[PDB]
Amino acid sequence: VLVQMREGTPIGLTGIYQHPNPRPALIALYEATLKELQDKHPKDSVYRQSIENLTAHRKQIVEDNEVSEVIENKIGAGLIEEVVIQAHEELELAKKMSEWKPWEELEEKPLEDQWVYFN
Amino acid sequence: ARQGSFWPVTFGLACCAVEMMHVSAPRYDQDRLGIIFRASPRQSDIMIVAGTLTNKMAPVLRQVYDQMPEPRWVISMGSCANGGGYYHFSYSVVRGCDRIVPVDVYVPGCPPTSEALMYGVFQLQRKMRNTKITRMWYRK
Amino acid sequence: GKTLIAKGTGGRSSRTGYTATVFGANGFLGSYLTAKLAKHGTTVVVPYREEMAKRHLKVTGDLGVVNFLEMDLRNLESIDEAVRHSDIVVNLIGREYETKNFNYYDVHVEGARRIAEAVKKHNIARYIHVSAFNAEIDSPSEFNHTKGLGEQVTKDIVPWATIVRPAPMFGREDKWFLDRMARSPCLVSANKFQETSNPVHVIDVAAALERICFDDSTVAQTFELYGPQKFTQKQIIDMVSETLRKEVRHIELPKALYQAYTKATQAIWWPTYSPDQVERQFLSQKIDPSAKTFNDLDLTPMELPDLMFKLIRPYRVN
Amino acid sequence: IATAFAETVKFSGSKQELQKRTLALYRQFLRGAPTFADLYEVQFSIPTIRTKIRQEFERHRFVDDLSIQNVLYAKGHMEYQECINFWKQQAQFLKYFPEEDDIQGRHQPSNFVDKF
Amino acid sequence: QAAPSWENIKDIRLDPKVHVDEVYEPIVNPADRYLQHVSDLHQYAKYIMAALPKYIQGFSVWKDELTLHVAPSAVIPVTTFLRDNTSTQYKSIIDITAVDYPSRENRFEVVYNFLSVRHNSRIRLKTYATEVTPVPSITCLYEGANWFEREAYDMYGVFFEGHPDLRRIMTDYGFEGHPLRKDFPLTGYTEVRWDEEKRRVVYEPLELTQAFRNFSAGSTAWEPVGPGRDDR
Amino acid sequence: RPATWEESEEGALSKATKYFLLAEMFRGLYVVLEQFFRAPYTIYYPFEKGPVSPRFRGEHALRRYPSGEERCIACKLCEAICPALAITIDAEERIDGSRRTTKYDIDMTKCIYCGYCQESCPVDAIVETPNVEYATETREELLYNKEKLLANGDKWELELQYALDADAPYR
Amino acid sequence: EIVSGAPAELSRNRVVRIYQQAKPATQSGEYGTFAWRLDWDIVDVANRWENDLIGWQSSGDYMQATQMKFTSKESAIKFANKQGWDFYIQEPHHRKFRVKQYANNFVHSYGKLKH
Amino acid sequence: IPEEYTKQAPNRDSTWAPAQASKTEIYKNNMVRFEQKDLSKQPMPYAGIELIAQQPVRFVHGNTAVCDGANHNGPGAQGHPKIFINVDAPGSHACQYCGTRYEKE
Amino acid sequence: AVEKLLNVEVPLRGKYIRTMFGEITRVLNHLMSVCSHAMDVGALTPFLWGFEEREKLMEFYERVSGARLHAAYVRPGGVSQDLPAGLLDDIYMWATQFGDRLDEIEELLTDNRIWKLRTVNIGTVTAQDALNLGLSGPMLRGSGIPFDIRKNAPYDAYDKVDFDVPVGMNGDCYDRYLIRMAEFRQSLRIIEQCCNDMPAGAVKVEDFKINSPPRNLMKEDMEALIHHFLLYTKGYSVPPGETYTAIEAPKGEMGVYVVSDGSERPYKCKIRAPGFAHLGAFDHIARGHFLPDAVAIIGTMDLVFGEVD
């Protein structure tokens, strides 16, 4: 229910307005991300153990720090509004990744003719 | 009078148009001679084809050429514009504008100098000085 | 002159080697025949008289297939030079009006005699001379009288004389067949306001002249290029006014009263409607019973009206 | 984020559906013929356009694979797209129309003797 | 400042302007800047391999850049990822185009170069498509595609799928054929234009050039055998 | 990410003055008037000429030696890099034993003036001129055969000698 | 089979050649051995005539100078039937093993002697 | 192919042909388009066949003759590259870049 | 793209002269872009004043190249030839006045109310969209992402020179104006320090297997002749494989994608042009305007259509 993906008509840095409450919206997005991906596809896959662990790491640094600036210098991304914008779409990415199940075997073997260039 | 004012219309397709607008630059100015080009094929006299000439362009070029009054000349500015030039071996290039429009003064080379374009212009005006149209009404 | 397989090739610059020379050719008919002639790889010497009018015949071919020489029918040496190197030569020549320096004589009689004398002095194979329709030796249109004299002179010397007599022609920028229909401020003439004859389309004239100018076994025959079917009168003006403007407005003036405009015509900067045209308005196609046509040279020339739909259609109302 | 005359690219599977789709394409491509004659001012008539369009589709009546017929459908609908407005010009447009004979003169009667 | 150019204050200098010595350009290394980055990038490719093992084929690393081989029927789920992951925040595409090698039965490899913004890191992604069968576009993900894939279609006839306005840009509008296929040569089939008799109808012919492109058919013994390098 | 409210205190009615009458725009008029007084830059091209560097490219004049035996040897290196294939050569053993050019052909229709011909003819026999002496009315007056190029080198080698003697220790 | 993107009538008219490029006899070196070549013939009336103005050789073949470089002969021929025109394949010719004792410089009773 | 001529030009300063297959006839050279033209279009090659007979033979009492052709005013190397030729039999006096004749004496 | 695919590196003289030539080329490109832009907008004087020193930059090509604007001067193996002396002496005296005249053309466009309603928040392209459009270069940095290639993937000695990159704040055409007008007075610093730091060394590549021999000893040596001969007959050997290389041309990121056979000639070359991507983005940008808006928004995104294909 977090409608603070991106705001409207305020003046932040690069053509994307400033969200009002970035910490509660972001911690709700991390909670929803952990609720979706963990309960859909198995913990065997490296993809879950990567997205999940990075998600918990970001969750830790958000839930610890207070201002919207120290969280930047620890998060390794750009602006915190843009951190929220980034943090939106992996929820929908894992949500799509429910479908087209990638942790299965490789569905196609090319003929090995296709991957020959020279020598 | 025809030799004095002498304005073209830009057709101006490529690099050779960059040298054409260098003739409008202050170093080798057009307006010290009278060359004040309009962007309109009826108000024009001569039609400088500059740049290479695609296969795709050429009907538009001949349609521009036809809506142009009768004392008309054509300058082929640039090697590509005459005898196809540096491409000449494309599927999509026209091997010289001699396949499209009749030309009265050629101008050689990829991009010819602003010097070169003005030298071609003075050679065209030197041709104008031998037009002898009134005494050709008298049938000399 | 001896050659290889036939005329019609399938690609430009697969060049022939036939070296032609076309007189006139700046104006009306000589556009399309050298357009058909340089299209298929033949060297053309086209002489001219006006420098600014010769330009639009250059783009028909690319290289060596169009050349300019500065002829003039006064100068013997110019025409002498003009067909030194030629192989075939046609002359479409002759204004439809006298100039301020030319008679109707010696624009296709002694003008023809000079160039045919150059032909005989150069042994040029395949001399083709166009001449007018209705080319009699009678007076009434001294144009026609002079064309009959010209055919007589071209048969006096040079038995290599393929004379061709086209009808009134029909093409883009028709000098006095459709320009007096298209612009037509008040087309007013023809005391006999009907009773003309055969029209022939111009590209069919050019195809006839092309298919005569290369094949042999046609030396000294004379051709007349008949209209395909209709041989129609000035009622085609009505079909011209089938286009919605109907501005044609023929006012059918008296004959001797019409002379004054023609006598005005000699004073003007530009030619208008000189009186041998007015006299030819009293004539018709005195069609030769024995002259080979499009059916002999294996062509079928196109009809009038459906071609006129294409040919006059800038000039509609909406 | 736009179109020009709703060019869609989505090849179906079944050959019946591709049949119906080419059929509706043929209807629009045939219906636009007086619009073509208006737009380009040809000499010939609208039935000449119609018999040549029919000729062009009879050129590929007996093509087997639907997975060739897909890109043939794309070529057809795409040249309809470039004909329904004034992208093509009449010099570009006459490349479908071997109209006149008199350009050629006498030529090959498809005999061996007159190859020589 | 002052004292710059003309209307001169009579002050200038074209003297004593030198550094005279003998050069000391001590170097031999062709490509050693990249080896730490290549060792990082192997491991990054191993991450992408283990993360999405269904849809990917073998990675291929070369000289500080990266190329992912992808089965062609499934590209859209790959590029929902890898554009738009947190750890792979690329979001900026720089090239889609095609390359024929008409050796193999599949004929046209289709090559994508993508660009990161947060990470300053390029990537390449390849599929293989035949003239017969299409591969889907990537215009569903972003809007920078629908021009480039027109360019790909025009140069090749690599037909696409799921895409609006698959027109021609890069050729003439009545021109069939596809140029960057190595089928038809430089001259093209019909490329002439002339306009004399059938007036202004600049209609083509069989393109008969004035001097043919006399080729380059020389070849020496053998170029080189590569000094391989991998992290592992 | 500078927040930069910037609501108030830009000016105190001076803002209405600068907006109201065109002071910022009258400034540009004063600039172009001050530019009006200064020097022009036209070069009367029939009578004067722009700067011609020695490495500038021209019309392909063939050099010969001192007492020149037609310095081109048809070595074909200037063929194999003309990037529009504007070079067509044919060669033969001439009567006196050496090899010479039977014909030498430059499509000045399609000479890009890359100078690679000059950068590779080892005896330095084809040379880009500095002369812009051109503007023929036919293509048939552009297709330079051997005689045009030998004539063009015979018309000037003075200028070419100046050019090489400022360039050949850099080529 | 209909051609999808081949506007010529090449596919019914000409004979094309699949050939291994021959080993040149002048140089030693064998890089032309490791290709396969597609080449259209010049069996033509067009067939590179002579110009008359400058004297180049203006051809009439729109596809005179064209070479594919393939990998395998059967991949070559699967392409050649896929795009579908009449071919002719040409088998290469190897060089046969012959044992070369450098010591071939010894005789019995025999007339002829060499360097 | 017909009868016409304009006697105003031989081949060059040398009278006959310069080499094998370099003709000087004009009718085969398409006399159609030489007309109305000066003949003072450029016959400027002096046919370097004549210019070796201009050149005097140089003598070297060694056995190997160096040839450069480069000037002694140019700052850069401009002559043909350093071919070493032999002067051994009389007759082979031919630097194949310049045609300067080197005889052993 | 080629010398990356050769595993060679041009010496330091070559990198500095290609960098300074890249930045006078950058001055030339942004100058002609702003001039043609302002001519389409309507002012004629900035166009002609800018071409007045474009003619001096034409000479600075001409004293190096063989022509005025086109040049075969860069090679894969470095460049063609070292500079002449009076060029390097003169180019300082040029750059002495170019900042003053750049201010002179700057004073009558940047400040006026025309260009302030003639250019407003017009053609606003957000960064979320601009990354999704395949835009680059000046429009990208106008949309406020401090990213180019030169400071971020430093080819050819931009590493070694103090180079500051302007960043937009609003994604309109006005910051796309002002970011070019800042890149002028950033490139002039580069011409300054490349006039200072110019070393002495080989300006081609060091060996002669790959580019060209020196023309002095190509007439005193066997090996120099065989390298000269094969370098102009068969080109040269290139190792096989792919590469892609992008630099920020002054119109945006130009990419070159080259698949080399392992032979004399490139098996595939695909260019990549900002004038082919920005043109592709044009429809998404142009909506909700008028036609005299669209004339300016052509010239902002550097639509010189000789970089389409």
Ligand SMILES: NC(=O)C1=CN([C@@H]2O[C@H](COP(=O)(O)OP(=O)(O)OC[C@H]3O[C@@H](n4cnc5c(N)ncnc54)[C@H](OP(=O)(O)O)[C@@H]3O)[C@@H](O)[C@H]2O)C=CC1
């Ligand atoms: N009503 C008609 O017009 C008909 C035409 N014909 C015949 O067809 C022939 C060609 O028709 P068309 O194409 O309209 O002719 P044109 O209107 O094109 O004129 C012929 C060209 O030859 C030039 N010319 C040649 N000799 C002279 C000369 N002594 N004096 C002045 N000008 C000369 C003319 O002017 P310039 O010197 O300036 O180039 C003109 O350019 C005509 O001669 C006619 O006999 C037959 C049936 C109907």
Ligand code: SF4
């Ligand atoms: S003639 Fe030269 S300058 Fe003009 S477009 Fe062609 S290549 Fe460019």
Ligand code: SF4
């Ligand atoms: S200057 Fe360039 S285009 Fe001209 S002939 Fe020499 S290499 Fe070819």
Ligand code: SF4
């Ligand atoms: S490079 Fe030299 S030897 Fe070779 S063809 Fe040209 S002039 Fe003759």
Ligand SMILES: [Zn+2]
């Ligand atoms: Zn010598």
